[PDB]
Amino acid sequence: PRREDPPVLEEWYRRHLGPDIHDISSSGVHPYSFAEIRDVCRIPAADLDAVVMDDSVSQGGEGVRRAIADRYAGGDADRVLVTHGSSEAIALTLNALLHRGDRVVVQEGIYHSLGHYPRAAGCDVAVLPGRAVRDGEIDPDVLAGLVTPGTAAVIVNFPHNPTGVTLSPQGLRALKERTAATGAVLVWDAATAEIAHRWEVLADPGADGGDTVSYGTLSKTFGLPGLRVGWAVAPKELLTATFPLRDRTTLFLSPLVELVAERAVRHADELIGARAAEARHNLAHLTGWMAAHEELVRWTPPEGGVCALPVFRELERAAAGPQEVERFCLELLERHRTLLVPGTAFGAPHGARLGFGGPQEDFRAGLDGLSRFLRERAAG
Amino acid sequence: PRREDPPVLEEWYRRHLGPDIHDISSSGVHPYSFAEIRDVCRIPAADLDAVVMDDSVSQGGEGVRRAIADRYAGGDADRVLVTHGSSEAIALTLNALLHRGDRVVVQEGIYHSLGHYPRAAGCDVAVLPGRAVRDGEIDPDVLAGLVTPGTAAVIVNFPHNPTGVTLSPQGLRALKERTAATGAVLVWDAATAEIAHRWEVLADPGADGGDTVSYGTLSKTFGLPGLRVGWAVAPKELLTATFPLRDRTTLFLSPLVELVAERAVRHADELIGARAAEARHNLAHLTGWMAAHEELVRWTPPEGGVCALPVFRELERAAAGPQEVERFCLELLERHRTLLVPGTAFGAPHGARLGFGGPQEDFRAGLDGLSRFLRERAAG
Numbered sequence: 001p002r003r004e005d006p007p008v009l010e011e012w013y014r015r016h017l018g019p020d021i022h023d024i025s026s027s028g029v030h031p032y033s034f035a036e037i038r039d040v041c042r043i044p045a046a047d048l049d050a051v052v053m054d055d056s057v058s059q060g061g062e063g064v065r066r067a068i069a070d071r072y073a074g075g076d077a078d079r080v081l082v083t084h085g086s087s088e089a090i091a092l093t094l095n096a097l098l099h100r101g102d103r104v105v106v107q108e109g110i111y112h113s114l115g116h117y118p119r120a121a122g123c124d125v126a127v128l129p130g131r132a133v134r135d136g137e138i139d140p141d142v143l144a145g146l147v148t149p150g151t152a153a154v155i156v157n158f159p160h161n162p163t164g165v166t167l168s169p170q171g172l173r174a175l176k177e178r179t180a181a182t183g184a185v186l187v188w189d190a191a192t193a194e195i196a197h198r199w200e201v202l203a204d205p206g207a208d209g210g211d212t213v214s215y216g217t218l219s220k221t222f223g224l225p226g227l228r229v230g231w232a233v234a235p236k237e238l239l240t241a242t243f244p245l246r247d248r249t250t251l252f253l254s255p256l257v258e259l260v261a262e263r264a265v266r267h268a269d270e271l272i273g274a275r276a277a278e279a280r281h282n283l284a285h286l287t288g289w290m291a292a293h294e295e296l297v298r299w300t301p302p303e304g305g306v307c308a309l310p311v312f313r314e315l316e317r318a319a320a321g322p323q324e325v326e327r328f329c330l331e332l333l334e335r336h337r338t339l340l341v342p343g344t345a346f347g348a349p350h351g352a353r354l355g356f357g358g359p360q361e362d363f364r365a366g367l368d369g370l371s372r373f374l375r376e377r378a379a380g
Numbered sequence: 381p382r383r384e385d386p387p388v389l390e391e392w393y394r395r396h397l398g399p400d401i402h403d404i405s406s407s408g409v410h411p412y413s414f415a416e417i418r419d420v421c422r423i424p425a426a427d428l429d430a431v432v433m434d435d436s437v438s439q440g441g442e443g444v445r446r447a448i449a450d451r452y453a454g455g456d457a458d459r460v461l462v463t464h465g466s467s468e469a470i471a472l473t474l475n476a477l478l479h480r481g482d483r484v485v486v487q488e489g490i491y492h493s494l495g496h497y498p499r500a501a502g503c504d505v506a507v508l509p510g511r512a513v514r515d516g517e518i519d520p521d522v523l524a525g526l527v528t529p530g531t532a533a534v535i536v537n538f539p540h541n542p543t544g545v546t547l548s549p550q551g552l553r554a555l556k557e558r559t560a561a562t563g564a565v566l567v568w569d570a571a572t573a574e575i576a577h578r579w580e581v582l583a584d585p586g587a588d589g590g591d592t593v594s595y596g597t598l599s600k601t602f603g604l605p606g607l608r609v610g611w612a613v614a615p616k617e618l619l620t621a622t623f624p625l626r627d628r629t630t631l632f633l634s635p636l637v638e639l640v641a642e643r644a645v646r647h648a649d650e651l652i653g654a655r656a657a658e659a660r661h662n663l664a665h666l667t668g669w670m671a672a673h674e675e676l677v678r679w680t681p682p683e684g685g686v687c688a689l690p691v692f693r694e695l696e697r698a699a700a701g702p703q704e705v706e707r708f709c710l711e712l713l714e715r716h717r718t719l720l721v722p723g724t725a726f727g728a729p730h731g732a733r734l735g736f737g738g739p740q741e742d743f744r745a746g747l748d749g750l751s752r753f754l755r756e757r758a759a760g
């Protein structure tokens with residue numbers, strides 16, 4: 001068999017998800033039960049039972065496309081592609097968009113699949129450093145100097161998994177001005193767009209009707225990672241260009257899943273709202289906890305989404321092999337029943353992803369486990 | 381956008397599926413409603429409602445893997461990979477199995493995705509001609525002469541979409557003897573294995589616990605193309621080797637869909653049986669119809685599955701541009717409301733796929749439409 005290393009993030013979860021743990025590691029809000037979905041999204045059993053289990057269509061079912069378009073594409077259902085998670089939307093669209101030798105600017109520490117496709121296509125990749133994004137804007141000098149005339153694409157995820165850094169409306173305006181000026185295609189992964197802490201929720205660039213590619217998903221802010229539904233918003237020409245690859249990989253989605261997805265999107269405010277309130281309660285708690293532990297841990301406060309990247313000063317002050325944070329997280333898990341994702345999953349060897357979108361009581365228990373672990377290490 | 385021609389089969393359906401037609405074109409049995417699935421497969425609403433919409437796992441949920449393994453993998457759930465249709469199982473496994481320069485024997489006129497992956501990987505492809513398969517066996521001289529020492533893989537689909545040709549137990553034994561003798565990996569697409577007309581249902585090679593790769597799906601004999609669930613049976617080492625690609629494309633399936641899939645597989649005999657009886661009734665009808673139209677159409681009688689490839693003598697006797705059968709099918713559709721798939725989808729320019737797994741009454745109407753069309757063309 002052809003050997004390739006799996007991404008660190010997904011391998012970590014294959015090995016360490018399990019029973020009797022405090023999972024404070026996710027970039028998403030905790031999942032709804034199907035019961036709760038039927039209640040909130042008003043899905044009578046009769047509506048499900050009526051679905052004929054036949055083929056759907058290559059672009060995604062019209063009903064689910066329309067629901068997504070009304071929210072993120074300015075009402076244009078022709079500019080939505082409905083996929084098996086946003087994972088599939090990324091794979092399909094980046095395969096069609098990116099060409100060998102294209103110059104592409106990619107955010108530092110971006111979700112693995114977004115970093116993979118430009119490499120695989122043989123693009124000339126330039127990295128936009130994380131430090132260049134602060135207070136809601138990309139540093140103007142860096143923006144102008146990295147995104148240059150003839151750049152093919154700029155690929156970003158805001159709010160950012162795992163740091164929670166995001167843009168303000170002004171910051172996004174400036175980014176769109178520069179991609180317009182240079183002819184670059186903005187590729188905008190908006191997985192966690194619906195939860196913003198510092199500024200307002202950012203309008204999807206896909207609503208403009210131009211040459212941008214946007215992603216979203218039900219996995220991170222809707223409580224539906226296990227529905228496996230995401231999307232791209234992009235010009236129809238790009239979306240139809242994905243069909244040859246879709247025809248040899250997934251064909252199309254299930255009409256049963258598409259019914260549930262349409263209803264979820266139509267009730268987005270309810271699904272997101274309940275979970276976002278819980279996430280905000282946990283973030284308040286986390287803010288105090290971080291302050292109380294400032295001698296041992298530092299961070300950038302998250303500005304959007306439901307996770308952050310605390311940095312453990314012990315790992316920096318020694319600056320050990322980058323594997324050290326993996327061993328830290330393994331020991332935290334085994335001794336204190338508490339799960340983070342080691343920063344090696346995100347190109348951040350001194351930090352770990354800490355999620356605050358999970359249930360409140362378990363979140364506090366996870367924080368207690370980590371506090372005890374940190375104290376043990378500081379002492380002795 | 382990167383331009384590639386979509387496969388003829390999938391483009392044909394994007395353009396021509398619609399209301400008020402007699403669809404006698406499918407390689408599958410007609411779909412169940414979700415109501416019927418809940419009834420037959422004994423799925424109470426409470427069981428669905430209890431599903432937490434969280435992540436599943438890279439190999440496929442344990443319950444669905446076990447149900448599939450008991451049927452096709454000799455009980456070994458570790459040798460099953462559960463995927464989004466068999467389309468995904470093919471893409472994942474062939475990506476991992478096939479290397480540049482590997483010698484691969486591929487059945488003539490094989491489903492497009494199975495033909496694509498060896499080409500894409502840069503394999504040295506040799507074609508096993510359709511004529512070499514007859515009366516349940518590959519011609520011994522051709523088998524020995526094409527599948528040679530050091531051949532990496534032999535890729536076949538039996539029963540065959542679209543001709544319905546298949547092997548007997550003896551034929552499959554001989555094929556397995558030769559792959560064993562040469563060290564080749566048999567790649568066995570068993571999408572339509574459960575419906576056999578001439579010999580018994582063929583045991584899945586995956587049940588042996590050796591180095592073979594098998595595919596199956598709920599799409600063609602279970603009435604569940606819209607559930608989007610298939611599988612590979614293969615050595616676990618190959619299956620785990622697919623994870624890096626799965627991690628950047630689909631991640632995993634929905635636990636809700638996996639519950640339904642497990643129950644469907646456990647009730648396979650009931651789901652398949654009802655539909656197979658209907659298909660056999662239609663095949664009897666089709667056999668008489670073919671005999672009555674023998675001056676205008678010829679075929680190999682299907683030996684398995686639920687479709688056949690009638691050949692229109694008019695297209696052979698003139699041997700026109702291969703596009704002619706597409707125009708034939710377009711005209712049949714518009715004038716007589718009857719859908720076939722043109723043989724250009726299967727490398728068979730003088731024939732068209734005619735499916736007999738659909739509803740009985742519509743099937744007769746489709747045959748009437750085609751009979752009238754053929755008579756019109758013969759006359760004038």
Ligand SMILES: Cc1ncc(COP(=O)(O)O)c(CN[C@@H](CCCNC(N)=[NH2+])C(=O)O)c1O
Pocket residue numbers: 009010013014026027084085086087088111157161189191216217218219225229230435436630631
């Ligand atoms: C930023 C971003 N973009 C896309 C995706 C893809 O998720 P889907 O929409 O396909 O669901 C993601 C997902 N990231 C998470 C993946 C977790 C996988 N689960 C398990 N069990 N391994 C994550 O970061 O954990 C993000 O983030």
Ligand SMILES: Cc1ncc(COP(=O)(O)O)c(CN[C@@H](CCCNC(N)=[NH2+])C(=O)O)c1O
Pocket residue numbers: 055056250251389390393394406407464465466467468491537541569571596597598599605609610
């Ligand atoms: C032989 C074979 N192997 C795999 C597949 C893949 O189907 P899934 O398991 O992923 O469902 C197939 C499927 N073939 C059919 C595809 C029809 C697509 N539907 C539409 N609307 N385009 C087909 O031959 O029609 C086969 O056959």
